[PDB]
CSV table of C-alpha atoms and ligand atoms in Angstrom, one decimal:
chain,number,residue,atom,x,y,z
P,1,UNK,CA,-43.5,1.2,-73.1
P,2,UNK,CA,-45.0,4.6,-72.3
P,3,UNK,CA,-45.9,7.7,-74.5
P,4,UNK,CA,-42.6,9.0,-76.2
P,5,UNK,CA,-40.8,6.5,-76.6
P,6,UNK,CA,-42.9,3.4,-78.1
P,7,UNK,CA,-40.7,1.5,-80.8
P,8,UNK,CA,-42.3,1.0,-84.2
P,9,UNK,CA,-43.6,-2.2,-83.3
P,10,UNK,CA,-45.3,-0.4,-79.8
P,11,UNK,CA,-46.3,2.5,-82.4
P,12,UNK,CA,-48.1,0.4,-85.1
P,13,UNK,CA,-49.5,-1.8,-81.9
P,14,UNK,CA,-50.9,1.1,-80.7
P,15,UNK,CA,-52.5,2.5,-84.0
P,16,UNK,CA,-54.0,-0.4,-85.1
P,17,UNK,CA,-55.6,-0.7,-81.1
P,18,UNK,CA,-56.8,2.7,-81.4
P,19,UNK,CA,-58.2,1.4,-85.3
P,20,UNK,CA,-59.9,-1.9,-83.5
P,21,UNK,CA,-61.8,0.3,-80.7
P,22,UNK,CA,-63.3,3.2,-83.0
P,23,UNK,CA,-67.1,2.0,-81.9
P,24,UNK,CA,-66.1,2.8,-78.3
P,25,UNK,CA,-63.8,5.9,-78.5
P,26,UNK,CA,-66.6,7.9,-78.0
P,27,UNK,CA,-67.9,6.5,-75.0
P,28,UNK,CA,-64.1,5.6,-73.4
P,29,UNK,CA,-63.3,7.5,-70.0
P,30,UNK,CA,-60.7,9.1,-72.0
P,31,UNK,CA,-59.4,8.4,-75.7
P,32,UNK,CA,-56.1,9.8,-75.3
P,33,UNK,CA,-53.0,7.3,-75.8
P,34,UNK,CA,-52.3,7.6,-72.1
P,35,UNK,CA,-55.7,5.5,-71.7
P,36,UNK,CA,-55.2,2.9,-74.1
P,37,UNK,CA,-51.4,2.2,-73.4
P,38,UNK,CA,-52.3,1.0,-69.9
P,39,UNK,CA,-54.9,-1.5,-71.5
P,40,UNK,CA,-51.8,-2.7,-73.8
P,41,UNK,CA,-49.2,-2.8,-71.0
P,42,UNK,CA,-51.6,-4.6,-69.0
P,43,UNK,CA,-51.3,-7.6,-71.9
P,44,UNK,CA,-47.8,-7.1,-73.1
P,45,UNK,CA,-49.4,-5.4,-76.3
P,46,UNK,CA,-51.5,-8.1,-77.3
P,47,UNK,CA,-54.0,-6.8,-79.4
P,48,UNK,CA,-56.7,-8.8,-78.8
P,49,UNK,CA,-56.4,-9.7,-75.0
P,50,UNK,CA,-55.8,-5.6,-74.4
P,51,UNK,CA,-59.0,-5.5,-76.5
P,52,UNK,CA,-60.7,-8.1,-74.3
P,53,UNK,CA,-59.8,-6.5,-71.0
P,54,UNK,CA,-60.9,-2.7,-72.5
P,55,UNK,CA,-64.1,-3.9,-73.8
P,56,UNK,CA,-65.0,-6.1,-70.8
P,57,UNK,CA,-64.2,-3.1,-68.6
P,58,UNK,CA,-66.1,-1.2,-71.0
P,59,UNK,CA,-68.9,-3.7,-70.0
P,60,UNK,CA,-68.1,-3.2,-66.7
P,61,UNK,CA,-69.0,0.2,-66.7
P,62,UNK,CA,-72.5,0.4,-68.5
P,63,UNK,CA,-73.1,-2.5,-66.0
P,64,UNK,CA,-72.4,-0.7,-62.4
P,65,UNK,CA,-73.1,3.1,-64.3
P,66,UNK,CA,-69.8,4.0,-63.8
P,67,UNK,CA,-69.9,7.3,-65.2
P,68,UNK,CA,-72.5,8.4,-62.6
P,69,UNK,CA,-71.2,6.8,-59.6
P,70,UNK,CA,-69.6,10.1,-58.6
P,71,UNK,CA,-73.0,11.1,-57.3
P,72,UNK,CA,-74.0,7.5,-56.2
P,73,UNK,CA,-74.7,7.9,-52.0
P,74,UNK,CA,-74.2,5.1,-50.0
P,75,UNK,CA,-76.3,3.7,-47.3
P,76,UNK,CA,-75.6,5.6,-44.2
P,77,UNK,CA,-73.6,3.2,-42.5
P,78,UNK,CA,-71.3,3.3,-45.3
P,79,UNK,CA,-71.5,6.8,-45.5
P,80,UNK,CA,-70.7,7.7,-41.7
P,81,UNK,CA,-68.2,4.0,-40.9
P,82,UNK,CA,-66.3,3.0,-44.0
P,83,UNK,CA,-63.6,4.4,-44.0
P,84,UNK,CA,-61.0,6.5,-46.1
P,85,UNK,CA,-60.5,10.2,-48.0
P,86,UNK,CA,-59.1,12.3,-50.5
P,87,UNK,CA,-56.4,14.4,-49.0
P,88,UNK,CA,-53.7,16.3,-51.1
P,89,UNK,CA,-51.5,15.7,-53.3
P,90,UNK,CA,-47.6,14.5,-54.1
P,91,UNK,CA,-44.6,16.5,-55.2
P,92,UNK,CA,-45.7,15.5,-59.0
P,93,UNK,CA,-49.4,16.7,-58.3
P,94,UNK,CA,-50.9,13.0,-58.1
P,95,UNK,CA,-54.0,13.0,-55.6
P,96,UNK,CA,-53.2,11.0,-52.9
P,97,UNK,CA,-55.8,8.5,-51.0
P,98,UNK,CA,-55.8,7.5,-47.2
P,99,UNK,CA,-57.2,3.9,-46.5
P,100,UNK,CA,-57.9,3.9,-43.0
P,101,UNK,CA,-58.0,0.3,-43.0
P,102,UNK,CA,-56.4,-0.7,-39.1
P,103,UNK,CA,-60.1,1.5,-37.7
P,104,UNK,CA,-62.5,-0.1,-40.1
P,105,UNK,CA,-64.8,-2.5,-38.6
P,106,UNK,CA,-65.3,-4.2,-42.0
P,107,UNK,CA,-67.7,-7.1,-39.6
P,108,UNK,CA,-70.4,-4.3,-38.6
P,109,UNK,CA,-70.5,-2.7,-41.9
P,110,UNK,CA,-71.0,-6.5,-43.7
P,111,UNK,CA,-73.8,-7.2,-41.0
P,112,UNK,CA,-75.2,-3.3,-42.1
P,113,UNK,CA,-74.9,-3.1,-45.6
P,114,UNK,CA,-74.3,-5.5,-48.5
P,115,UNK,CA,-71.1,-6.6,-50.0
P,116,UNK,CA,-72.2,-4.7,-52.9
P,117,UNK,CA,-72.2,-1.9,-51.6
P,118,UNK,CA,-69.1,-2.0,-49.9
P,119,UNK,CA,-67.3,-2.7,-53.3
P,120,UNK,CA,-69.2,0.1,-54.4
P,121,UNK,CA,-68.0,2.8,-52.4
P,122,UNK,CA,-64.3,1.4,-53.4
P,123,UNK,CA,-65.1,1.5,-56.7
P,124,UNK,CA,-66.5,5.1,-56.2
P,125,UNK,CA,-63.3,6.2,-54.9
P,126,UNK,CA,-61.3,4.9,-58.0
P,127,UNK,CA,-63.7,6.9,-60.4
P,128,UNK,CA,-62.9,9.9,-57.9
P,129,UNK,CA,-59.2,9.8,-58.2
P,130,UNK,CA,-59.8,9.6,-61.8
P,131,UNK,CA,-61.4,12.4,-62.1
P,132,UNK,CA,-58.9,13.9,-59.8
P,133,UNK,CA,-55.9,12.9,-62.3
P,134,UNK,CA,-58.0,15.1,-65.1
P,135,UNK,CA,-58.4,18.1,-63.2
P,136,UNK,CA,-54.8,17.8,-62.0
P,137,UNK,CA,-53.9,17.5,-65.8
P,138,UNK,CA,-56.0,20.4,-66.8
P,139,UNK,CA,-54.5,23.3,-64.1
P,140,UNK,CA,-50.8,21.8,-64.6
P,141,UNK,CA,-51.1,21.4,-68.1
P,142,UNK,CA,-49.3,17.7,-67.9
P,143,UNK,CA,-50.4,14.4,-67.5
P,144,UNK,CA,-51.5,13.1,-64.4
P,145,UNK,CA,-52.1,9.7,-64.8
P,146,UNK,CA,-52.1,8.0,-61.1
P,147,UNK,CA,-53.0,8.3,-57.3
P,148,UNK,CA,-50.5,7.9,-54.3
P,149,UNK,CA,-52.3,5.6,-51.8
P,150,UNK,CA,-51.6,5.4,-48.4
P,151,UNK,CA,-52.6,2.4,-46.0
P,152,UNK,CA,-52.7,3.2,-42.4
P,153,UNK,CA,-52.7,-0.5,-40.8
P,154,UNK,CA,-52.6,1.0,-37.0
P,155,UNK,CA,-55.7,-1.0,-35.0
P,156,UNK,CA,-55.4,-3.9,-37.4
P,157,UNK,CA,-56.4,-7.1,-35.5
P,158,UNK,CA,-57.4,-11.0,-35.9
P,159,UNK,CA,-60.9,-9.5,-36.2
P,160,UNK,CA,-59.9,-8.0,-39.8
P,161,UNK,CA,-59.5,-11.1,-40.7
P,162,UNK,CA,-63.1,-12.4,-41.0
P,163,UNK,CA,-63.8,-14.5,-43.7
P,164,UNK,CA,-66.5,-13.1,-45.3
P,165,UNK,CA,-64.8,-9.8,-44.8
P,166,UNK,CA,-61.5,-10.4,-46.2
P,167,UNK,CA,-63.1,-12.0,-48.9
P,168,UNK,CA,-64.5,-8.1,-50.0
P,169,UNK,CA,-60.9,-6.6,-49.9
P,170,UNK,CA,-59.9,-9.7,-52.4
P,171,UNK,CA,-62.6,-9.3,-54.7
P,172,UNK,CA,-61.8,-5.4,-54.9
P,173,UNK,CA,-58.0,-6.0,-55.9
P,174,UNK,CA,-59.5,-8.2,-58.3
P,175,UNK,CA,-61.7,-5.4,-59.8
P,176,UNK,CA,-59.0,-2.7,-59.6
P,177,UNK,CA,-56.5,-4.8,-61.9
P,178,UNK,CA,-59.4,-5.5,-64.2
P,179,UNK,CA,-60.6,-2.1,-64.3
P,180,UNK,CA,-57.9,0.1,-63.2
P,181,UNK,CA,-55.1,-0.9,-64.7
P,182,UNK,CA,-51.6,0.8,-63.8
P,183,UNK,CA,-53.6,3.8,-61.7
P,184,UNK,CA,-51.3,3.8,-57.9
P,185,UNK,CA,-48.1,5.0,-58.3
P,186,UNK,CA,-47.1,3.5,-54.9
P,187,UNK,CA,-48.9,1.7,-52.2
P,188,UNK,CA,-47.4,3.1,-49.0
P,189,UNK,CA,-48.1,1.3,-45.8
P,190,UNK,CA,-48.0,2.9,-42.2
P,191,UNK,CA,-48.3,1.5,-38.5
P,192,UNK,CA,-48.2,-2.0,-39.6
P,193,UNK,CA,-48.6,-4.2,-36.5
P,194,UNK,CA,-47.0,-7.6,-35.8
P,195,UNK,CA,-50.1,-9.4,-37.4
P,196,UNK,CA,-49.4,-7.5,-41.3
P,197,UNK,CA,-47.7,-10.3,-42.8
P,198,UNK,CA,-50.0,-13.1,-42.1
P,199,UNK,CA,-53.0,-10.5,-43.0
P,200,UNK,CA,-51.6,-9.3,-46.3
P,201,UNK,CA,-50.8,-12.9,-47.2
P,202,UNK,CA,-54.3,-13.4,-47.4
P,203,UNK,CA,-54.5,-11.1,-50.4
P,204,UNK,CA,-51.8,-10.7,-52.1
P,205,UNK,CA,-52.1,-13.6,-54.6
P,206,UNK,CA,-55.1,-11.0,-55.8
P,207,UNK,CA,-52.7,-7.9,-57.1
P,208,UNK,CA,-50.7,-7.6,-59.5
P,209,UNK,CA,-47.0,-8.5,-59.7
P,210,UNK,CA,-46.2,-4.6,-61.1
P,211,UNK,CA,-48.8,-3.8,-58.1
P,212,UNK,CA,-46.6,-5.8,-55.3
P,213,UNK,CA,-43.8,-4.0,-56.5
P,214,UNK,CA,-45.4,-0.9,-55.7
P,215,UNK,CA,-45.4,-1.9,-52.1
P,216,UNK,CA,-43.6,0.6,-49.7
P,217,UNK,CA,-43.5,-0.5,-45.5
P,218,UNK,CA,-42.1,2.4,-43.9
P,219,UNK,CA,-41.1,2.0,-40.7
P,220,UNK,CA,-41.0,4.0,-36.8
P,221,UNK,CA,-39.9,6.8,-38.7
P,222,UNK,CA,-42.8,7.1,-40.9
P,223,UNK,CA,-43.4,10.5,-40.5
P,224,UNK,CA,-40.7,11.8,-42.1
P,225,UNK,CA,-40.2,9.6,-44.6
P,226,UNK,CA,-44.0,10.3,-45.8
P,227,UNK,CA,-42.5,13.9,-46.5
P,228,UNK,CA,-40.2,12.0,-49.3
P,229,UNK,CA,-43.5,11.7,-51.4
P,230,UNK,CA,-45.7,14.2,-50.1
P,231,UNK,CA,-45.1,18.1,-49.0
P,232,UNK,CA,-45.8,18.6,-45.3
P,233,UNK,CA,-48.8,21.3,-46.2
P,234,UNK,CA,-50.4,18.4,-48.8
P,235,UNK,CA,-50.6,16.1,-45.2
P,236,UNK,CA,-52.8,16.2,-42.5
P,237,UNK,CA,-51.2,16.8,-39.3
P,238,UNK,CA,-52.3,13.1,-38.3
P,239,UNK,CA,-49.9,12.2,-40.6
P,240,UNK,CA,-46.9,14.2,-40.0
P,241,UNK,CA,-48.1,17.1,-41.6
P,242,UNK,CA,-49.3,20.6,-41.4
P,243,UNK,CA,-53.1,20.5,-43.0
P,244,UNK,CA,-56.2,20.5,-40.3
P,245,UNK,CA,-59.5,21.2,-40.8
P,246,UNK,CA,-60.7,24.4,-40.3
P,247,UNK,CA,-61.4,24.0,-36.4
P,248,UNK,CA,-58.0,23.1,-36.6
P,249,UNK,CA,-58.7,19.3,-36.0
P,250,UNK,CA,-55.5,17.5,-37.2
P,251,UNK,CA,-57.2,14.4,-38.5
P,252,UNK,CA,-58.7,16.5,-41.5
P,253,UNK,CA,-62.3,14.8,-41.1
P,254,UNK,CA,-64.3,16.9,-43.4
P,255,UNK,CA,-62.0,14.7,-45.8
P,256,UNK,CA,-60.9,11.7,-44.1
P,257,UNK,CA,-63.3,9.3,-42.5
P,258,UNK,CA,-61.7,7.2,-40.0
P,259,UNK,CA,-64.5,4.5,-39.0
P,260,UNK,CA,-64.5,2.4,-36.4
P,261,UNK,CA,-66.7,0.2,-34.7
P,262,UNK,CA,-70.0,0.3,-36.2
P,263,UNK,CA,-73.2,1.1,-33.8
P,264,UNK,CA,-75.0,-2.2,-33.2
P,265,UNK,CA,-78.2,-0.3,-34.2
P,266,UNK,CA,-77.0,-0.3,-37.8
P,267,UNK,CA,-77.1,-4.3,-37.8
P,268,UNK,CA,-79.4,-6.0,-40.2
P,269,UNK,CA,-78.3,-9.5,-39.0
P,270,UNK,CA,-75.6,-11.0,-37.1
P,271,UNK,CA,-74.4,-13.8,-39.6
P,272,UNK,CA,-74.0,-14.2,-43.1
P,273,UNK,CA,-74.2,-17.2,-45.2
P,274,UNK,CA,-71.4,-19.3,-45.3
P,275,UNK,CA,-69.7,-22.2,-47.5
P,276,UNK,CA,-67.6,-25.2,-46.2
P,277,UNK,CA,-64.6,-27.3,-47.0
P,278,UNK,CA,-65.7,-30.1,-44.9
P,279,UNK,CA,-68.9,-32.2,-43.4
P,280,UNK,CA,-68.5,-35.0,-40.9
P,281,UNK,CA,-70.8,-37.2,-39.0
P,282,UNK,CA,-70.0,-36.7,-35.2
P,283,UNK,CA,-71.8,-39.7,-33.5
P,284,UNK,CA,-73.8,-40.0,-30.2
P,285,UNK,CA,-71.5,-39.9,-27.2
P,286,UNK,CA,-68.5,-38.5,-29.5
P,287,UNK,CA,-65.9,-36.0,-30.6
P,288,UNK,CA,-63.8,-35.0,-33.6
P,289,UNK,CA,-60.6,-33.7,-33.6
P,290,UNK,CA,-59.3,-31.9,-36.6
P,291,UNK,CA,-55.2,-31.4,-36.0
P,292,UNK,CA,-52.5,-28.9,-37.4
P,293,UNK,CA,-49.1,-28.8,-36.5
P,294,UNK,CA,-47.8,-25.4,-36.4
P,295,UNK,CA,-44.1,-24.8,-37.1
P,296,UNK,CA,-43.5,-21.3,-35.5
P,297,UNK,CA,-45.4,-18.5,-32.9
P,298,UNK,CA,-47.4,-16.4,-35.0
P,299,UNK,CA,-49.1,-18.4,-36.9
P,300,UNK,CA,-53.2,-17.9,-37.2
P,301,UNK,CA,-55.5,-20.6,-36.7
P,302,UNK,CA,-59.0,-19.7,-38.5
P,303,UNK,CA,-62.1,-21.8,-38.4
P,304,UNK,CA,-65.9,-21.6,-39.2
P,305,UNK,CA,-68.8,-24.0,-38.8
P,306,UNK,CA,-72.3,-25.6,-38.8
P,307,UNK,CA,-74.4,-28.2,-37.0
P,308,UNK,CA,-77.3,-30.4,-38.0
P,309,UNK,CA,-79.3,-32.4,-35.2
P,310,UNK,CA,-78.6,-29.9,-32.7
P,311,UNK,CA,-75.9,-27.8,-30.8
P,312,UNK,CA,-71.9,-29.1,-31.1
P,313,UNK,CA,-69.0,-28.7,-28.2
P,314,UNK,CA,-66.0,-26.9,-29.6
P,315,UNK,CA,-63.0,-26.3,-27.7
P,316,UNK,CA,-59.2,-25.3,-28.9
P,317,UNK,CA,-56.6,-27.9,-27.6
P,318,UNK,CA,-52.6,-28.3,-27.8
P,319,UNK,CA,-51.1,-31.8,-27.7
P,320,UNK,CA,-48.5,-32.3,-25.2
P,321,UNK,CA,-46.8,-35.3,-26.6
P,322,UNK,CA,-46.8,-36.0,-30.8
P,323,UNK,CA,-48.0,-39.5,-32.0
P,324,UNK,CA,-51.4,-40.7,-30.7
P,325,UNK,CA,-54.2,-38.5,-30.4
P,326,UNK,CA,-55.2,-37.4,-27.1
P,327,UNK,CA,-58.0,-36.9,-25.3
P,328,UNK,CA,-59.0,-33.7,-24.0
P,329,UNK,CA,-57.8,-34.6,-20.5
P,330,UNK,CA,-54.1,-34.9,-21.5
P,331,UNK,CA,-53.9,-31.8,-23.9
P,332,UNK,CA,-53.3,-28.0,-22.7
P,333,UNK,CA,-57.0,-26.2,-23.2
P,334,UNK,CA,-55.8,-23.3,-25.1
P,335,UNK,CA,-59.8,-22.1,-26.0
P,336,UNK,CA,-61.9,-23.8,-23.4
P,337,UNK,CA,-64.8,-26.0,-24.4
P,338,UNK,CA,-68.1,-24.2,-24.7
P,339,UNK,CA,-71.5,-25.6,-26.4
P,340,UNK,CA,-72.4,-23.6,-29.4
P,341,UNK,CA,-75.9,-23.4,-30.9
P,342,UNK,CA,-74.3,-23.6,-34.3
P,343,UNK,CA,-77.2,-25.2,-35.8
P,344,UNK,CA,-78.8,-22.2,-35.7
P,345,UNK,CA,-76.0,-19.5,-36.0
P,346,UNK,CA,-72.9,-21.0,-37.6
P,347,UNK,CA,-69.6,-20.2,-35.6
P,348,UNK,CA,-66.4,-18.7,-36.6
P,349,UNK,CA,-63.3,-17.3,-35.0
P,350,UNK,CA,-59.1,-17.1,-34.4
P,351,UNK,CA,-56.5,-17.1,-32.4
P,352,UNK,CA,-52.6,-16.4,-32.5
P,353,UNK,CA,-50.5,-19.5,-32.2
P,354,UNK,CA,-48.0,-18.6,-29.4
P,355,UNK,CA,-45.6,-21.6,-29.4
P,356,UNK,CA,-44.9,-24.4,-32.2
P,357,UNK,CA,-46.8,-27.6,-31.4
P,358,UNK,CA,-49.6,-29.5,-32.6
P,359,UNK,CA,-52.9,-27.5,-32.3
P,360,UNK,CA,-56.2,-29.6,-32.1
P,361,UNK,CA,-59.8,-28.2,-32.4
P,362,UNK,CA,-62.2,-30.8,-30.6
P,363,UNK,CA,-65.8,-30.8,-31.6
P,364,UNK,CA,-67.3,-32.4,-28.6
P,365,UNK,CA,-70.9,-34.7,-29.4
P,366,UNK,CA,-70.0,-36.5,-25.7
P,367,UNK,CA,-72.8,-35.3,-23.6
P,368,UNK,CA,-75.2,-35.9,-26.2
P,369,UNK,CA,-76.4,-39.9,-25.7
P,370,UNK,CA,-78.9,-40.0,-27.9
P,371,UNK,CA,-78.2,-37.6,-30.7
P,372,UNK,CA,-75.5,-37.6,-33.5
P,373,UNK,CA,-74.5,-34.3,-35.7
P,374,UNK,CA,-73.9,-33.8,-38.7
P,375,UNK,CA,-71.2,-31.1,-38.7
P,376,UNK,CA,-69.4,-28.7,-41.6
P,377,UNK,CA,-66.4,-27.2,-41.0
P,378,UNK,CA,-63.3,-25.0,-42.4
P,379,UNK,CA,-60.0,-25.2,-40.6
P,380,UNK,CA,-57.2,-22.8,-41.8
P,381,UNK,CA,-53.5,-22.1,-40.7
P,382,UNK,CA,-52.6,-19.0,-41.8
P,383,UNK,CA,-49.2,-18.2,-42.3
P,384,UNK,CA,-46.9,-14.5,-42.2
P,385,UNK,CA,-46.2,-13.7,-46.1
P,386,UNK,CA,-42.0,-13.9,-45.9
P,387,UNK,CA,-41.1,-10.8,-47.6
P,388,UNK,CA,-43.3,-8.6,-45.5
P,389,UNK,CA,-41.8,-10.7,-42.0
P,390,UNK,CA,-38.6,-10.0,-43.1
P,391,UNK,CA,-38.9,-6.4,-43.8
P,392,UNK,CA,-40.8,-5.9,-40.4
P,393,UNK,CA,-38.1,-7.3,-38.2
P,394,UNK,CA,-35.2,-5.4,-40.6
P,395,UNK,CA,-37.2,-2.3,-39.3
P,396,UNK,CA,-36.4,-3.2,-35.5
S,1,11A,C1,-51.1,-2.6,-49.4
S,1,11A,C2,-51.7,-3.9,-48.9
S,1,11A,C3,-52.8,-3.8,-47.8
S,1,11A,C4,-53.0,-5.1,-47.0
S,1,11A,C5,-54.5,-5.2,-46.5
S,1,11A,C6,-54.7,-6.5,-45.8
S,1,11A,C7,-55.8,-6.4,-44.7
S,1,11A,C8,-56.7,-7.7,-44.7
S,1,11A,C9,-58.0,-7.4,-44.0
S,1,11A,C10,-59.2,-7.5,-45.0
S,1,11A,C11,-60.3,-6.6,-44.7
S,1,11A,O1,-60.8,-6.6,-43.5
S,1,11A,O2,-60.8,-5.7,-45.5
């Protein structure tokens, strides 16, 4: 349903969309029918929910002053650690964009910046290639209408999965299908580690369907078949191509920013507020024990949580017989038992299952006589998405 061929339905649609919007074509990022047929894709050319989405993105951008964001400077931390560039472009002349996302410390720069201004800078980068696609369409003379982005998952670890940061990368594909409809021509993922199934899992109920499909893994041979959608000189050497900056340093920094870990001189605070699914009363003298049976290795246990009335013990157990619970005696100690003041600082961390069984995390009250605590938790067993695990072990 694209520009030449619209039926007569697509082509009155489209008129009478272009009719409905005439207060905004003014003031729209473009006004071509380029622009307004992703709106109407984006709702199967219903005129008045492609009208919503326009106008609320149209909201959007008065809201966030989109139109100036272009000259919008970060805090420094964001400037010099979050990650990311501009570098080149495809065979077609489509910009492409690096996400540096296995070297990000996404945990520093939350305890640094804000969330807002991490979503920010994304959204920065989206106006960019935007602008990008215009000039590209101005010295080729053809529509350019999307970006080529490439995801470089090499580092990626349990500690990109942080809550509170993973939580940022959902609400962003949230805000790119609501803002930037149809705008990646493919989403091409590099270097992705074991842990890439149960990671993306975590978000990929936030992009599109059209967007999944988009999805490219490539495999040990990356390299090469990166040069099936991009020219050797339009790639940095990093990346199996020929493009350096000018002291010759393949990564191409003076347009790439790879990040990593964020100096602890940047940090603002060392915890950020967070929400519950559960609250328990742990009473004087005793212990909870909040169990998960875990099917296969690989698996991720995640957990966070808070006291009240003082500190709490918390230790990571596995039974070694199903049936009645066991005490911390009989069980293998898989995380040994540590107190944590989490009454003051509230807790969080993971771990990689490494065998099926039942996993228990023990909150341990049993050295305290006198005092109970109140105590809020969130367990979660993260799973590999099954597409992604498949493809990964068809790769060798
Ligand atoms: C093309 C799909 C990219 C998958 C990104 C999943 C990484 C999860 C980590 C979230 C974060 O730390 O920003």
């Amino acid at each position: 349903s694209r520009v030449g061929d619209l039926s007569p339905q697509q082509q009155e649609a489209l008129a009478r969309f272009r009719e409905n919007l005439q207060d905004l074509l003014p003031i729209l990022p473009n006004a071509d029918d380029y622009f307004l047929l992703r709106w109407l894709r984006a709702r199967n050319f219903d005129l008045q929910k492609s009208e919503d989405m326009l106008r609320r993105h149209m909201e959007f951008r008065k809201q966030q002053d989109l139109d100036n964001i272009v000259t919008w400077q970060p805090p420094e931390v964001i400037q010099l650690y979050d990650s990311g560039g501009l570098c080149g472009y495809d065979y077609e002349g489509c910009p492409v964009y690096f996400n540096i996302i296995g070297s990000l410390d996404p945990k520093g720069l939350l305890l640094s910046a804000s969330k807002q201004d991490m979503i920010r800078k994304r959204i920065k980068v989206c106006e960019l290639l935007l602008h990008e696609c215009e000039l590209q369409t101005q010295k080729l003379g053809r529509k350019i209408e999307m970006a080529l982005m490439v995801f470089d998952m090499e580092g990626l670890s349990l500690k990109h999965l942080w809550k509170p940061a993973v939580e940022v990368y959902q609400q962003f594909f949230s805000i790119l299908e609501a803002n930037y409809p149809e705008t990646l021509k493919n989403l091409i993922v590099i270097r992705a580690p074991k842990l890439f199934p149960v990671a993306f899992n975590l978000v990929k109920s936030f992009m599109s369907e059209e967007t999944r499909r988009k999805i490219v893994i490539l495999g040990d041979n990356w390299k090469q078949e990166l040069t099936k959608f991009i020219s050797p000189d339009q790639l940095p050497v990093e990346f199996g191509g020929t493009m350096t900056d000018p002291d010759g340093n393949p990564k191409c920094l003076t347009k790439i920013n790879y990040g990593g870990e964020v100096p602890k001189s940047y940090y603002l605070c060392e915890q950020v507020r967070l929400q519950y699914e559960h609250t328990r009363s742990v009473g004087r003298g005793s212990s909870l024990q909040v169990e998960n049976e875990i099917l296969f290795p690989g698996c991720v246990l995640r957990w966070q949580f808070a006291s009240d009335g003082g500190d709490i013990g918390f230790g990571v157990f596995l039974k070694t017989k199903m049936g009645e619970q066991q005490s911390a005696r009989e069980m293998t100690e898989v995380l040994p038992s540590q107190r944590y003041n989490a009454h003051m600082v509230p807790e969080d961390g993971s771990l990689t299952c490494l065998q099926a069984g039942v996993y228990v995390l023990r909150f341990d009250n049993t050295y305290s006589r006198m005092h109970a605590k109140k105590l809020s938790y969130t367990v979660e067993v993260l799973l590999p998405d099954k597409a992604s695990e498949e493809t990964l072990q068809s790769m060798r």
